[PDB]
Amino acid sequence: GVLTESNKKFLPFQQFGRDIADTTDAVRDPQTLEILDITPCSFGGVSVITPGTNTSNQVAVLYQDVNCTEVNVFQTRAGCLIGAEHVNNSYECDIPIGAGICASYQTQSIIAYTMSLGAENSVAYSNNSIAIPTNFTISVTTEILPVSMTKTSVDCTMYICGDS
Amino acid sequence: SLGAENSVAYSNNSIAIPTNFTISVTTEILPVSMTKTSVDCTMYICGDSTECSNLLLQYGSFCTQLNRALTGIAVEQDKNTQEVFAQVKQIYKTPPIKDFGGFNFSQILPDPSKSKRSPIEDLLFNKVTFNGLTVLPPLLTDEMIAQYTSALLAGTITSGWTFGAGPALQIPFPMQMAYRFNGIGVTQNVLYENQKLIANQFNSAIGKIQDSLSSTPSALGKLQDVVNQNAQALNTLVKQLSSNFGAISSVLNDILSRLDPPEAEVQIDRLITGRLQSLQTYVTQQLIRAAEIRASANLAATKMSECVLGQSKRVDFCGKGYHLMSFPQSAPHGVVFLHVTYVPAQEKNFTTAPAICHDGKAHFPREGVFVSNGTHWFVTQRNFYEPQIITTDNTFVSGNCDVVIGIVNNTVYDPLQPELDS
Amino acid sequence: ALGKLQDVVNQNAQALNTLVKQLSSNFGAISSVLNDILSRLDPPEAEVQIDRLITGRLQSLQTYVTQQLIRAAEIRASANLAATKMSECVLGQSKRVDFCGKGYHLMSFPQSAPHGVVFLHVTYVPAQEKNFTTAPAICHDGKAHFPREGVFVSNGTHWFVTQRNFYEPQIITTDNTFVSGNCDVVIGIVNNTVYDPL
Numbered sequence: 001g002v003l004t005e006s007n008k009k010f011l012p013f014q015q016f017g018r019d020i021a022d023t024t025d026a027v028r029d030p031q032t033l034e035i036l037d038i039t040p041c042s043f044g045g046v047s048v049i050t051p052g053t054n055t056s057n058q059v060a061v062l063y064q065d066v067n068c069t070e071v072n073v074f075q076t077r078a079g080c081l082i083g084a085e086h087v088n089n090s091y092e093c094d095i096p097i098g099a100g101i102c103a104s105y106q107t108q109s110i111i112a113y114t115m116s117l118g119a120e121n122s123v124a125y126s127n128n129s130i131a132i133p134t135n136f137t138i139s140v141t142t143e144i145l146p147v148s149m150t151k152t153s154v155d156c157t158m159y160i161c162g163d164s
Numbered sequence: 165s166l167g168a169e170n171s172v173a174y175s176n177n178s179i180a181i182p183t184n185f186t187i188s189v190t191t192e193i194l195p196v197s198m199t200k201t202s203v204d205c206t207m208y209i210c211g212d213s214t215e216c217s218n219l220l221l222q223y224g225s226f227c228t229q230l231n232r233a234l235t236g237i238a239v240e241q242d243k244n245t246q247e248v249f250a251q252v253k254q255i256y257k258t259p260p261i262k263d264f265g266g267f268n269f270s271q272i273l274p275d276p277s278k279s280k281r282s283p284i285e286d287l288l289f290n291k292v293t294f295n296g297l298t299v300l301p302p303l304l305t306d307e308m309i310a311q312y313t314s315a316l317l318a319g320t321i322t323s324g325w326t327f328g329a330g331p332a333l334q335i336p337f338p339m340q341m342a343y344r345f346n347g348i349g350v351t352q353n354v355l356y357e358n359q360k361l362i363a364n365q366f367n368s369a370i371g372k373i374q375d376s377l378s379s380t381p382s383a384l385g386k387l388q389d390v391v392n393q394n395a396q397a398l399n400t401l402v403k404q405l406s407s408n409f410g411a412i413s414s415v416l417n418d419i420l421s422r423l424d425p426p427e428a429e430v431q432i433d434r435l436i437t438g439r440l441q442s443l444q445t446y447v448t449q450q451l452i453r454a455a456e457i458r459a460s461a462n463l464a465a466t467k468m469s470e471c472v473l474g475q476s477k478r479v480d481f482c483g484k485g486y487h488l489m490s491f492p493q494s495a496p497h498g499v500v501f502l503h504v505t506y507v508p509a510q511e512k513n514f515t516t517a518p519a520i521c522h523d524g525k526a527h528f529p530r531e532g533v534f535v536s537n538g539t540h541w542f543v544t545q546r547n548f549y550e551p552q553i554i555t556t557d558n559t560f561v562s563g564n565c566d567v568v569i570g571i572v573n574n575t576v577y578d579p580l581q582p583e584l585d586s
Numbered sequence: 587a588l589g590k591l592q593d594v595v596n597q598n599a600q601a602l603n604t605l606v607k608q609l610s611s612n613f614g615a616i617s618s619v620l621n622d623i624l625s626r627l628d629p630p631e632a633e634v635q636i637d638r639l640i641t642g643r644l645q646s647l648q649t650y651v652t653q654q655l656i657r658a659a660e661i662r663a664s665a666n667l668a669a670t671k672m673s674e675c676v677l678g679q680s681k682r683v684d685f686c687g688k689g690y691h692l693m694s695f696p697q698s699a700p701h702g703v704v705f706l707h708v709t710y711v712p713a714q715e716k717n718f719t720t721a722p723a724i725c726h727d728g729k730a731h732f733p734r735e736g737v738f739v740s741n742g743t744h745w746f747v748t749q750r751n752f753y754e755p756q757i758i759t760t761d762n763t764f765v766s767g768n769c770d771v772v773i774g775i776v777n778n779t780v781y782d783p784l
Contacts, residue, residue: 020399021294022406022414023211040295043207065298078301096242098301100308115303117311118255123334125259125322128774130720130737131333133712134753141687143705144587145668146594149661150701152602154650159609160643161620161636223642224611225604229649251684265773329689330712338773339722339737343750353732353766356722359773433614444649451656459663469684477681550766583784 006037042066044079049095051105060084060110062097074112076101084110091116177570179516179535182508183549187365189373190483192501193383194464195390197245198457199497200238200300201398203446205230208296208405209439211416215425219432226440230447237454242303244461248468248499249304249312256319256332265338266363269321271370272491272502274314281310281494282317284502287377288495291384292391294402306494313494316472320489328473341488347475348486348506349547366504373502387498393453401446409438464499468492471503486547512549517541517572520554521565527576530558534572541574553577590664591702597657605650613642668703672696675705690751712751721745721776724758730772731763731780738776745778757781 006026008017017026026037044066050059060083068080075081078098087106093115094104102115205227210216220227258273274280281289289306323332324340335343338359342352355362377383406414411431413419419431471482471490482490483503491502514535519526532543535551542551543558552558554576565571612618615635616626623635675686676694686694689709697704718739723730736747739755746755747762756762760782769775 019294020406021402023294043295044298045202045204064300096303098303100303100305115308117308117315118253120257121254121332122257122259123319123322123327123332124717125334127263127265127336128719128721129717130335130339130739131715131717132737132739132748132753133330133333133715133751135713136752137711137713138692139687139689139709139711141689141707141709142587143671143687143707144590144699144702145664145671145705146590146661146702147665147668148701149594149598149658152598152654154605154647156644156647159605159647160640164620164624219614222612222614224608224613224646226645226649229604229653233653325683326712328683331715333712333715334717336720336722339720342722351732351764351766353730353772356730356732356772357767448652448656451653455656455659458660462663466685470682474683 001038001040003036003038006035008035008037010035042070049081049084049097049103049110051095051110055105056108058083058110060103076112081112084112087111087113090114173513177515177517178513179533180511180513181533181535181544181549182510182547183512184510185548186507186509187362187369187488188483188485188505188507189366189369190503190505191373191377191383192467192483192503193386193495193498194467194501195386195457195460195498196248196464197241197302197461197497198237198390198454199394200241200302201394201450202231202234202238202298202300203401203443204296204298205440205443206296208294208401208443209436211295213416213420215420215428216416216432216436219429220436223436223440226444230443233447233451237450238300240454240458244458245302245304245309248461248465249309251328251465251468251473252312252315252319254332255311255315256322256327258318259322264321265336266359266367267337268367269317269370271374272317272493273321274310279307279310280314281306282313284374284377284493284500285310285313285495287374288384288493288500291377291381292387292496294405297398297402306496309494313492316468316492320472320491325474325489328469344475344488345506347477348488349545350506351545351548351550354548354550369504370502384495384498387495390457390497397446397449397453401442404442405439407438408435410434467501468499471501508547517570519565519568519571520559520574520576521571522574522576524565525561526563526565526568526571527554527556527559527561530560532558541572555579588699588702591699594661594701598654601650601653601657605646608646609643611642613638615639671705672703675707716753718753721774723772723775724763724778724780725769725772725775726778726780728768729765730767730769730775731758731760731765734762734764736762745776759783 008026010028015028016024019025024038026035028035045064047062047064048059049062060081062081063079065079067075068082072085073080073082074084074086076097076099078101084103090113091104093102096102097112100115101112103110103112206217206220210220271283274282319327319332321337322334324335326333338355341362342355345355346352408414411419411434416435420428467482470476471487472492475489476482476487483505485505485507488504488506490504493500493502517534519528520534520541529543532545535542535544541554543554544551554574556576556578559576610618615623615638617623620636620639623639624632627635671686674680675691676696679693680686680691687707687709689711692708692710694708695706697706718741721738723732724738724745733747737750739746739748745758747758748755758780760780763780
């Protein structure tokens with residue numbers, strides 16, 4: 001872990017502190033009676049933001065929840081992103097990263113931009129104004145719904161130990 | 165006590181018709197998303213000790229199944245939020261001035277003085293309050309969730325129910341409320357002729373809802389309950405790393421600092437079984453909980469589409485009373501709906517008859533009911549008392565008088581007679 | 587396009603593949619293959635290793651059955667929604683918004699699909715909007731006149747009453763407006779002339 005001086009006051013008899021999960025959180029140095037805190041080292045999952053292998057083979061990486069001061073470098077609230085650059089143009093969401101930032105392959109590199117909620121439209125409002133449609137467009141849409149899943153069965157005796 | 169006893173008089177000739185109404189704004193709170201928490205199986209079960217990991221790899225896919233399940237829950241939370249809130253193809257905006265014919269919406273619209281969130285949403289936000297585990301951030305921030313709620317309110321105020329079915333068509337707000345009354349069965353003269361009272365009632369109700377939320381701290385119980393359940397479950401998972409599970413010590417480093425491989429391995433195995441069982445129980449509880457939250461998100465998306473983006477004919481689905489129009493509000497991990505309902509109020513009991521006979525014919529009310537003030541007869545709408553003279557415009561004819569049971573004799577005025585006699 | 591059905595098949599197959607693959611793990615014993623464990627060790631020392639293998643396999647089976655019961659409940663919720671669409675959207679016409687396509691629902695047609703149903707939602711959509719001036723009611727004889735099923739609209743030279751969802755202008759007769767009250771109470775009332783068929 002990483003050791004840093006701890007302000008925790010140890011009574012004259014006990015030496016090392018304990019956390020809720022029974023892992024030492026603070027210890028007192030044997031040579032000098034000083035109180036130190038034990039903090040676990042930086043840890044976090046790493047995710048790759050990959051445009052499909054057909055489109056390209058360059059891939060950026062996302063270090064989850066670990067600011068990358070421990071080793072183009074965009075620090076987001078989802079971690080810091082390496083391999084992709086911040087942009088000021090907001091586009092529709094293609095790859096979701098988190099905290100409202102999304103990345104996609106643009107034409108070439110990977111760009112991480114603020115996600116775009118959608119277009120903006122202000123409808124003329126007045127106390128005496130109305131809009132009435134004049135034509136129409138019949139439209140057909142599709143809704144796909146799962147209805148059943150394959151009916152499987154497992155023999156417990158044969159699976160656990162077959163023919164014994 | 166189940167409820168207040170109240171028996172209602174019934175008679176074969178009696179009717180009771182409303183005479184005045186009370187606009188009412190009620191509230192509904194629904195959980196829409198959970199917290200996207202992921203727990204690493206190896207870094208929780210075997211704490212950075214390779215001697216433990218080598219034993220762990222012999223338990224097959226148990227480590228990766230739990231990660232896969234938790235990832236599924238975490239993605240589903242984002243899908244739930246997108247489904248409930250992202251129902252708009254455009255981000256509509258309010259007009260700069262607020263000439264809504266007497267309706268003050270300051271308590272629901274976004275306020276620029278502050279994060280731009282409505283005065284109701286601020287009160288909502290304020291009220292709601294090992295190495296393996298981490299919390300992932302939501303895809304949609306609270307600012308964007310408020311933008312979508314702002315868009316839905318702005319469309320439902322300026323363009324009415326037309327924005328959700330196609331292009332947004334503007335409408336004057338009082339006309340929009342008149343169509344909503346005409347929807348619930350009440351003619352639009354009633355709104356046009358009581359506009360000040362209806363605006364006053366609506367403004368007072370919306371103002372009262374803010375105090376109601378503040379006065380009771382337990383209004384947001386559903387959202388708080390969801391947050392507490394998740395937190396407690398994670399806390400129990402962290403606590404289970406303090407149990408020996410039949411070994412000599414819970415601490416892995418100590419149990420490896422005091423024994424040789426042949427003797428350390430048996431104790432490690434005992435811990436691996438216990439910790440893997442505890443994590444597996446946690447993952448299964450999270451899958452069940454996610455499923456109930458998914459049902460609440462699907463219900464919330466249905467209420468948003470069927471109630472905010474239109475008018476619902478479904479009883480009790482958007483508040484007690486007839487539903488006129490609803491307003492969504494964001495909340496932490498949830499959505500709060502504001503249902504505006506028209507409630508009948510001052511009932512007056514009048515006598516009634518199925519049909520009236522004038523010239524050997526039976527007349528039936530075109531829309532409305534037959535009532536008497538005790539002496540004369542009048543036909544009035546079922547959901548309001550606006551008594552009207554029985555002309556032949558508001559009734560139709562079918563049959564001889566004897567067939568209907570309860571037929572009464574009266575005079576049906578005919579507009580033809582005066583202009584034909586002259 | 588058929589992502590939902592594909593996901594259902596992919597998830598179920600991945601669960602079966604993991605359940606079968608877990609039979610290759612020794613779970614802390616000395617060999618996955620039961621025959622080797624039984625033969626290499628004498629019966630009284632073979633039994634404890636077999637017990638460890640049985641426990642691991644039984645836990646893998648229990649994890650599979652629990653995950654399937656959860657998945658099946660999600661499928662049942664989707665099947666119930668499909669039944670509600672097949673009842674309230676193809677066997678009838680639904681007033682409910684967004685239940686059957688983003689638009690006004692006219693009619694729907696079902697289509698089969700492997701382990702699923704696909705619905706074809708035919709929806710009317712308003713198309714070319716145009717801006718007209720409106721007024722709540724018109725006053726002609728010192729009386730109000732409210733539209734019966736339409737909206738008052740004016741191109742600047744006349745007043746017509748038209749359907750709310752289609753622009754078909756029509757004359758303001760007394761056949762389509764009902765009378766209630768006088769000029770003062772209704773806000774914004776516009777004085778105009780209502781023709782009569784008499």
